């Protein structure tokens, strides 16, 4: 069913801002839009794995979608 | 002595170089209406410092081949949203 617990979300939220009057349903809407972002990352990873005509997802495809999004460093 | 809030207080004393009517009009297209001209002063002088930092990058790359702004100098200026 779901692919993310509420526990890790609330851990990061009260990790960053513990003393905030923050509501609950806001956070589930954030989780739903985050799962839609997961589906977008899956679509981009399938496209960039169909790029090299292989059948195994690797570091380079994820890294290029990150260069579209964040420009990470691993 | 907290000079930033002292700067915000002494904003009433400055006189800009960009015409405040023109900055006000381009903020009217951007929907911004301040009867207090101090925010207009702040935005104008900050845009001047934006141009100054871009042209300083162009000047530091201008020493690499009296001074001329070039497409070579425009290339490190594209680092922000180029």
């Amino acid at each position: 069913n779901q692919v993310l617990t509420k526990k890790k979300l609330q851990d990061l939220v009260r990790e960053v801002d513990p003393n905030e009057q923050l509501d609950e349903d806001v956070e589930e809407m954030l989780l739903q839009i985050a799962d839609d972002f997961i589906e977008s990352v899956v679509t981009a990873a399938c496209q960039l794995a169909r790029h090299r005509k292989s059948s195994t997802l690797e570091v380079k495809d994820v890294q290029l979608h990150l260069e579209r999004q964040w420009n990470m460093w691993i | 002595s907290t000079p930033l809030v002292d700067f915000l207080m002494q904003l009433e004393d400055y006189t800009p170089t960009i015409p405040d009517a023109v900055t006000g009009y381009y903020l009217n297209r951007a929907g911004f209406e301040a009867s207090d001209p101090r925010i207009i002063r702040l935005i104008s002088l900050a845009a001047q410092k934006f141009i100054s930092d871009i042209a300083n990058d162009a000047l530091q790359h201008c020493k690499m081949k009296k001074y001329t702004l070039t497409m070579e100098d425009l290339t490190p200026a594209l680092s922000e949203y180029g």
Partner: protein, 89 residues
């Protein structure tokens, strides 16, 4: 001050990467010979990167309640956070 702060700031001060491996990686990416000043600059900028990473990992660790040694989730969470703030490209 304390003895451990002594040991930790000295291990700060003289940590540096081996010139052989930095030269090997830059010559296995460029494909030509590179000057040794490039190795100095690349090891220094890499040290700045590692330092920002470990500091953010400490921030993660202490804000998670947990205590050091830093775990893979802490360091990787930290480089991630340094990318999220628009501070590393």
């Amino acid at each position: 001050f304390s003895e451990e702060q002594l040991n930790r700031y000295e291990m700060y001060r003289r940590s540096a990467f081996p010139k052989a491996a930095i030269k090997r990686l830059i010559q296995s990416i460029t494909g030509t010979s590179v000057s040794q000043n490039v190795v100095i600059a690349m090891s220094g900028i890499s040290k700045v990167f590692v330092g920002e990473v470990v500091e953010e990992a400490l921030d993660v660790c202490e804000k998670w309640g947990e205590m050091p040694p830093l775990q893979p989730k802490h360091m990787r969470e930290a480089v991630r956070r340094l990318k999220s703030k628009g501070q590393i490209p």
